[PDB]
Amino acid sequence: SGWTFGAGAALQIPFAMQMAYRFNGIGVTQNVLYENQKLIANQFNSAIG
Amino acid sequence: VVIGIVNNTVYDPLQPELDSFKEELDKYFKNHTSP
Amino acid sequence: VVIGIVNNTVYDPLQPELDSFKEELDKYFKNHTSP
Ligand SMILES: *[C@@H]1O[C@H](CO)[C@@H](O[C@@H]2O[C@H](CO)[C@@H](O[C@@H]3O[C@H](CO)[C@@H](O)[C@H](O)[C@@H]3O)[C@H](O)[C@H]2NC(C)=O)[C@H](O)[C@H]1NC(C)=O
Ligand SMILES: *[C@@H]1O[C@H](CO)[C@@H](O[C@@H]2O[C@H](CO)[C@@H](O)[C@H](O)[C@H]2NC(C)=O)[C@H](O)[C@H]1NC(C)=O
Ligand SMILES: *[C@@H]1O[C@H](CO)[C@@H](O)[C@H](O)[C@H]1NC(C)=O
Ligand SMILES: *[C@@H]1O[C@H](CO)[C@@H](O)[C@H](O)[C@H]1NC(C)=O
């Protein structure tokens, strides 16, 4: 549900779509995420290792 | 490259500036090319 | 439905762009259709 469950009812969002919203608040457009989806997943998944 | 994209037609806000005025220009041109 | 609304005209910004071109184009049509 992302973060909407901290203000009332919980609403579902695809996880790929949700990460675009976080980049939107940072200051970078959401388009850059989809153009680099594959390497980010490898970068993030190996980060926790 | 974008995964999960879908097919549909997008509308330019300038289609009412082109599709609705190119037709007026066509409407004039048909009245203009007839003579 | 909105309370407190007032009366005036929303000056179209697309209008001067087309008007300046219509100062050409509408003039051109009268320049080209008349002969
Ligand atoms: C959205 O609409 C567009 C336009 O109709 C679709 O693009 C076209 O998709 C077909 C098959 O999906 C492509 O045919 C393929 O051509 C290749 C050769 O490049 C051939 O090897 C394949 O076996 C197949 O016949 C067609 O080329 C393609 N048109 C262009 C201009 O690339 C698109 O698939 C639609 N997408 C969805 C999700 O509906
Ligand atoms: C704003 O202007 C509109 C006209 O576009 C006014 O609407 C008219 O109001 C009169 C009575 O006030 C009616 O008899 C007309 O039938 C209305 N015409 C339309 C097209 O609505 C409106 O009253 C004006 N409002 C203010 C606050 O000036
Ligand atoms: C079409 O051309 C005729 C010929 O003069 C003219 O009377 C008429 O106003 C024109 N109409 C438009 C819409 O241009
Ligand atoms: C008016 O039409 C003539 C052709 O009849 C053309 O040569 C001229 O350039 C036109 N006027 C303008 C300002 O373009």
A11 C-beta neighbours (distance < 10 Å), count: 10
Q: How far apart are CA A22 and CA A2, in angstroms?
A: 10
Is the CB of residue B29 below 6 angstroms from any atom belonging to ligand 3?
no
User: In chain B, what residues touch A37 (CB-CB under 8 Å)?
Assistant: 3
Compute, in angstroms, the gap from residue B31 CA to the centroid of ligand 3: 6
CA A20 to chain centre: 5
User: Residue B29 burial (CB < 10 Å; 0-12/13-18/19+)?
Assistant: middle
Technique used: cryo-EM
Contacts of A21 (CB under 8 A, 6+ apart): A2, A13, A30
Contacts of B6 in chain A (CB under 8 A): none
> What three-state secondary structure class fits A30?
coil
Residue nearest to atom 5 of ligand 3 (CA): B31
